[PDB]
Structure 1
Amino acid sequence: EPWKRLPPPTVYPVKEARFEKYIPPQLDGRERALAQPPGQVAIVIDNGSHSVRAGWNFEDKPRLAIPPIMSKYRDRKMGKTFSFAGSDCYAARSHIRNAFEAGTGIVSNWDVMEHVLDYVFVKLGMNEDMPIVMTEAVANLPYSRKSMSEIIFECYGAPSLVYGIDSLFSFRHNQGQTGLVVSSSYSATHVIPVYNRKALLSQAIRLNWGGWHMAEYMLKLLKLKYYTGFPGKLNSSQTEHMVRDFCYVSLDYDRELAGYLDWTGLEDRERIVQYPYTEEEEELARIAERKKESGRRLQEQAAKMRLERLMKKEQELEYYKDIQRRMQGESKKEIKRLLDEAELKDEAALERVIRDLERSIKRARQQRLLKSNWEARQRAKAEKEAEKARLAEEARLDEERRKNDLEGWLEEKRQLRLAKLNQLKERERLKADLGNLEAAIRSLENDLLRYDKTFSYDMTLDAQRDWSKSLLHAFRYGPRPFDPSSQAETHRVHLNVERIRVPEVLFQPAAIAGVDQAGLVEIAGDILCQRLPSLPGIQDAPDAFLRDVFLTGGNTLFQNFDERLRQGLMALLPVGAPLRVRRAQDAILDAWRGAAGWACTEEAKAAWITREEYLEKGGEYIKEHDLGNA
């Protein structure tokens, strides 16, 4: 059997957002910053909903990368307040709040945002004056721009601030002259057309699906898969690591999906994630004796009721035979009068009752009464012994039938098996409503198994009911048997179809998760084919953009994401179009690197807003520039 042949399963421990070590204030960064030439130093903050990434413009990578979360609480034992603002929170008490509105790119809890920024400036080593470059959501809300500016200029007093878009910084860092920028991030997916290094933000589109939504959706699907119960505490922080580690984009979803749960090869399509389970004769002899006596008592009680039914049925039988002894040679009125004493109405009803009692009985001062009761048991024993005689010789006759008419005898077993299955079907398909054989079926199928070379176990009724012929076992537990007793085989989830079903929401949002928005290929194709050729200032559209479709943000890092997008776009473009899909180098940090390289250029310093310009114009005002919002 396959589960006996298959190797032991390979299993992956659950991963979650966890603290690992402290990091001190990085005073060498402050030292290096004070050493830079005038107007060539800035603090660069990539304000990401998954990670805030921060560092110095003159360095090649962030010094900090922390979730935009705070935890603040009063210790009920020690009696003092504690406060935390990143991965310093163990994501020990997880009183967590998040700066962003859940599943969106917009900051809305400004108290968390200040705590996150306090942690940033502390760990960058600021103690008392530095220009700030901060990334911003596409089409970011003016109220959030205002609130962020107020914090930067009036809480922290910074000399100058500029906002730009993480998608576009990533593009310019990778030599983006002109192209279609495709960003899938934690919060969102965007397609932005970029022309002559300037983004055409009036033509940008947002999907409202991203790496957060995939973690939440993977969580819903797992809580549905194991809806009858799962012992581990399923958190979307865990399903995020499952989506990172195990999910991939299909190159032909319907053909890969339709075969995914087929038992052959599911061993290699499944992946198994295991939660931290706990491993759990005089005693037994005495208890078993008490059980054995209790069972014996139940057996005696059944036999005592059976013996009461034996004596009752034999006494009933004797009475009905006493009628028959009269009825033979007596009138219909005597027949009717004796039947009326039974309140029966037919001699053959007495025959049926006489036989049916015998058919039941065969299965199962004082001395004259006691022995005549024992003689009713001897009348029962005569039915019981005649039953024994009947069965022994009838079986020997059938053994001759097997020897003498083997093929017809096999053909009989088929005809009987079907007829018995028909009665079971006539029972069950009806009783499935009307409720509001089996050993005979087996015995027939057993001889068919024994000697009918046309028969197989796969047609056995039990095989129709077997777990390894089911689909939901493959879905929930894969190629291998399952028992709830094993603490190691409980506490594990089998990902199966969700390996591919979760990434495919980007391509099929309404069909898979009901998002009611166009898929990624349809968004990009609407821009390339319908919009940009209509926009009158543009030249060489679409073709100039097709030469660089560019992938950015962590939620693009799925395997086959590029080739899926290429093959999807290839069918929407005219034949021989020079379509190139390209990945960013290091598609997460690369948006910060773009902001850092841009930070002190003349283009950036023309776009900087000073504290005094902020006091003049207010916090909604922005210098419009290639990499930022209008």
Structure 2
Amino acid sequence: RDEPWKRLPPPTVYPVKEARFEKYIPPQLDGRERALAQPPGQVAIVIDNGSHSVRAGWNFEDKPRLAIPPIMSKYRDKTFSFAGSDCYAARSHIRNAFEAGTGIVSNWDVMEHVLDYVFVKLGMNEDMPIVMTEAVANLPYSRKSMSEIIFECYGAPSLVYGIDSLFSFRHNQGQTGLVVSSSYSATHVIPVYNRKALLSQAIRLNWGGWHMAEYMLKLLKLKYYTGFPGKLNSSQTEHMVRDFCYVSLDYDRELAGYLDWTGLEDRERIVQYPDWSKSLLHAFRYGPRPFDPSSQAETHRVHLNVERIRVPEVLFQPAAIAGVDQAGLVEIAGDILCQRLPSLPGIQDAPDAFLRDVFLTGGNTLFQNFDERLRQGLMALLPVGAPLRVRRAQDAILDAWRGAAGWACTEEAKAAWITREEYLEKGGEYIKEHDLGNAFA
């Protein structure tokens, strides 16, 4: 039988998008000239301290000026010590400011040079207030060390810490809801009641986009079993996940009939690099086309069938696919909506208020059919008749900066700064209790 691969069309193949450099060195000095023209009290520098991409800019604009990874690299043959996106990922002594797998800064010799690159490329030749983001329920030593680097090393009037997902909440003009934000390091669920975060009962799932990339790397390492002639970086698997993964709607029916021969040519996604018809393992590794004859542009290919719907499914079934012994996103949301919020005194309506606006914030959210899966899960859990309306933010990876941009120069922010003499008197671990920041101690 020659039929199953005679009328089969030629393949449409996608190359590798590895996170390389980009030819830009701007010494942008046109922001300080506009910043010194505004009246005082309404000028502040906002830095989103993201784990995948630290962003920085001025508050009176809409787009951030700098958006770099925390990558630095220092070496010598004269000593080069450049950082940020200027590293090419051809010499790599790369160590990151964030600990791998958790958005808590514990590599301060890298974070100092990253902030140094930020203040150089913004233009500092001489004292502006600083609004800076952090992670939920941050460790006190990290906040103490960050405040020590802000005051003692550089010299700043004031800085204030906040949670970036709650800033994207405050920019999206919500009042009371359930912010579910899937970040690069962890996926948070935070209930907000009248512009105030209830951080005593927020729950973080320990999965994220970095875990997506690392688990995708492990499954491409174990799929291509006999040795694949190619460098399997983590970042190129991350760019595979970014454009070749979608959360399936009904998972147990889509999965079991996914590797059937009839129609596998349109499910399969193929990636370049610079008998058999009975077994499914040839369909799993290679596809409905015949075997590899060990050619030039045939061995250097990665085929993706199940990894499209298996890797972004770990957010919903964590204990079975990847063995993280925690709960799914739907089950965490149901645990908060149905079992904790009706049992908390001080609030009026637990189903009639928190279900009015459940929106999705973080960067690890822009998958096809992700809000619909969460809506069907919450529809299966909640009582009949609840006005459930799950939506997402407008600029999901950039609203975390814009929310702290709009917040930076208001009266509540002015009543929550920490000046230099307050750092000299109260100590290091001093917390102005704002409704977005963590609990005071």
Which TM class, normalised by the smaller chain length? over 0.9
Q: Secondary structure at the match of 1:555?
A: coil
Per-residue CA deviations over 1:277-320 (Å, capped at 9, x if unaligned) read xxxxxxxxxxxxxxxxxxxxxxxxxxxxxxxxxxxxxxxxxxxx
Report the CA distance between 1:235 and its aligned residue: 0.8
Residue 263 of structure 1 and its aligned partner are, at CA, apart by 0.8
Q: State the shift of 1:156 in Å.
A: 0.8
The structure with more radius of gyration? 1
- TM-score, reference length from structure 2: 0.98
Structure 1 residues 142 and 484, CA, compared in 2 at 3 Å: closer, same or farther? farther
Q: Secondary structure at the match of 1:268?
A: helix
Q: CA deviation at 1:250?
A: 0.5
- Report deviation, 1:73: 0.7
Distance 1:107 1:484 in 2: 49
Q: Distance in 2 between matches of 1:104 and 1:468?
A: 45
8 Å CA contact 2:97–2:108 kept in 1: the answer is yes
Counterpart of 1:492 in structure 2 is: 301
Deviation per CA, 1:381-430: give whole Å up to 9, x if none. xxxxxxxxxxxxxxxxxxxxxxxxxxxxxxxxxxxxxxxxxxxxxxxxxx
Q: Displacement of 1:543 after TM fit?
A: 2.0
Question: What CA deviation, in whole Å up to 9, does each residue of 1:45-102 have, x standing for no partner?
Answer: 0000000000001111100000011111112xxxx11012111001120110100110
Distance (whole Å) between structure 2 residues aligned to residue 528 and residue 619 of structure 1:
36
Instruction: State, as a whole percentage, how many aligned pairs show the same letter.
Output: 100
Q: Which residue of 2 aligns with 1:93?
A: 91
Cα RMSD after superposing both structures: 0.8
Instruction: Measure the CA separation in 2 of the matches of 1:227 and 1:47.
Output: 38
Q: CA deviation at 1:213?
A: 0.2
Task: Render the CA deviation track for 1:143-185: whole Å, top value 9, x for unaligned.
Answer: 0000000000000110100000011000110001000000101
Q: Are 1:219 and 1:236, in contact at CA under 8 Å, matched by a contact in 2?
A: yes
Contact 1:193 1:199 in 2 (8 A): yes
| Contact 1:67–1:86 (8 Å) recurs in 2 | yes
- Structure 1 moving runs of 4+ over 2 Å: none
Question: Does structure 1 residue 11 correspond to structure 2 residue 13?
Answer: yes
* Structure 1 partner of 2:253: 255
- Match of residue 233 from structure 2: 235
Q: Is the counterpart of residue 507 in structure 1 residue 316 in structure 2?
A: yes
Change (3 A) 1:581 1:588: same
Q: Is the 8 A contact 2:259 2:284 kept in 1?
A: yes
Question: What is the alpha-carbon distance in structure 2 between the residues aligned to residue 489 and residue 107 of structure 1?
Answer: 43
SS in 2 for 1:536: coil
CA contact (8 A) 2:351 2:386 kept: no
Cα drift, residue 20 of structure 1 = 1.0
Q: Is the 8 A contact 2:362 2:397 kept in 1?
A: yes
Q: Give the Å deviation of 1:550.
A: 1.3
Q: Aligned ranges for residues 584-623 of structure 1 at < 5 Å?
A: 584-623=393-432
How far apart, in 2, do the equivalents of 1:114 and 1:22 lie?
Answer: 22
Structure 1 gap ranges (5+): 277-465
Indicate conservation of the 8 Å contact 1:482/1:489, yes or no: no
SS in structure 1 of the partner of residue 316 of structure 2: coil
For 1:614 and 1:523, how far apart are their aligned partners in 2? 38
Rounded Cα–Cα distance in structure 1 between residues aligned with 2:147 and 2:373: 40
| Equivalent position of 1:183 in the other structure | 181
How many angstroms does 1:484 deviate by? 4.3
**Cα distance in 2 between the residues matched to 1:249 and 1:179:** 23
CA distance in 1, matches of 2:298, 2:253: 31
Measure the CA separation in 2 of the matches of 1:517 and 1:209. Answer: 10
CA displacement at 1:542 relative to structure 2:
2.4
Contact 1:548 1:581 in 2 (8 A): yes
Deviations for 1:3-31, whole angstroms, at most 9, x for unmatched residues? Answer: 12100111110111110112322111111
Q: Once the two structures are superposed, what CA deviation does each residue of 1:453-483 show, in whole Å capped at 9, x if it has no partner?
A: xxxxxxxxxxxxx101110011100110122
Q: Distance in 1 between matches of 2:415 and 2:293?
A: 67
Q: Tell me the distance in 2 between the aligned counterparts of 1:119 and 1:484.
A: 50
Summarize deviations over 1:569-620 as a string: whole Å, max 9, x none: 0111000111111100110000100000000110111111101111112221
CA contact (8 A) 2:128 2:156 kept: yes
